[PDB]
Amino acid sequence: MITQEMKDLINNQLAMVATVDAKGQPNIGPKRSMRLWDDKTFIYNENTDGQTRINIEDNGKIEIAFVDRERLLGYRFVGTAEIQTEGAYYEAAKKWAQGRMGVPKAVGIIAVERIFNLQS
Amino acid sequence: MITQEMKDLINNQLAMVATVDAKGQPNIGPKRSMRLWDDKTFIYNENTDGQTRINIEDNGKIEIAFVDRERLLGYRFVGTAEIQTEGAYYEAAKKWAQGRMGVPKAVGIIAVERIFNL
C-alpha cells in the first residue's frame, strides 16, 4: 500500500500530525519518532503527553503529512489511531527508544486507510 | 502578541494548516501564501477548491503550525477562519498575488486566538 516512493520521502521529512479534540478544535504536532511499523501501519513514541495523545484517545481520528519542501511534493495519510501503554506495540517502541531517546510514556499506532499526495 | 522570532518563522517556514470536516476527520495541508495581515490576523491566498477550504467554510476551526527543523523550534496558532470571494480582504489578496502567483480563487482570513510553543 505504502510504496517505496512514499517510504523514501517519509524517511527524510518531519511528520506533522493533525488530530481534533472533543470540541472540534484541530491540533498539529510534529512527531520526530513517527515511522513505519509495516506497510499499512505507522507507529510513534509518545514522549510529550500533550494534545495529540488526548485527541487520539478521545476519538482516534488522525492525518499525518510529510512535505518535501525542495519540490513541494509530499504524502498525507488518513487513518485511525490509538494510544497504548503496554503490550507488543509499546514494547517494540520501548526497545526502539533505547539509545535514541527516553522511555516512551506511551506508543501511538496509526492504521492507514487512505493516502493522498499534496494536490487538490 | 506576535513576537519577532514568531515573525521570523512565519516568513521563513512553511505554514502547515490543520482543519476538520463535518464528520470530525482532521485535514492538514501546506499553504505557501500564508502571511501576517497584522499582529492579530493571518491571511492566505486560496488557490484551490480543496479540503482545507471546504473545512474552513464548514466550521471555521483552524490551527496553523510553523516548524524550524534546524533549531527544533516552532509555533502553533489557534484561531477562527473564514473564506471570502469578494471585498476588501479579497482585493488585498488579489493585489498581493500580482507578480507572485495566479489570481486567487478566494482569500482565507484567520483571527488569531491563542499561541503555543513547540
Author numbering:
A (entry chain B): 1 to 120
B (entry chain A): 1 to 118
Sentences from the paper on this structure:
Hence, spy49_0662 was expressed with a 1.4 kDa C-terminal V5 epitope tag used for Western blotting followed by a His6-tag for immobilized metal ion affinity purification, and the resulting protein was coined as HupZ (heme utilization protein Z). The tagged HupZ is a small-sized protein previously shown to bind heme, and it exhibits a trace heme degrading activity in the presence of NADPH and cytochrome P450 reductase (CPR). This protein shares some protein sequence similarity to the members of the IsdG family. In summary, a comprehensive biochemical, spectroscopic, and structural characterization led us to propose that the observed heme binding in HupZ is through its His6-tag in a sandwiched di-heme complex from two subunits with an oxygen-derived bridging ligand.
Because our UV–vis and rR data suggested a histidine as an axial ligand, we turned our attention to His111 in HupZ, which is the only histidine residue aside from the C-terminal tag. We mutated His111 to probe its potential role in heme binding. The H111A variant was crystallized in the P6522 hexagonal trapezohedral space group, and its structure was solved and refined to 1.98-Å resolution. Comparing the structure of H111A to the wild-type structure, the two superimpose well with an r.m.s.d value of 0.99 Å over 237 Cα carbons, indicating site-directed mutagenesis did not induce an undesired global structural perturbation. The UV–vis spectrum of the heme-bound H111A variant is nearly identical to wild-type HupZ. H111A in complex with heme was EPR silent, as observed in the binary complex of wild-type HupZ, indicating mutation of His111 did not lead to an observable change of the heme-center electronic structure. Since H111A and wild-type HupZ show nearly identical UV–vis, EPR, and rR spectra, His111 is not a heme ligand for HupZ. The difference in SEC between the heme complex of wild-type HupZ and the H111A variant suggests that His111 is exposed to surface or involved in subunit-subunit interactions; and thus, mutating such a polar residue facilitated the formation of high-order oligomer structures. We noted that the H111A variant had similar activity comparable to that of wild-type HupZ, suggesting that His111 does not contribute to the observed activity. The only remaining histidine residues are present in the C-terminal tag; therefore, we conclude that the heme binding to HupZ occurs at His6-tag.
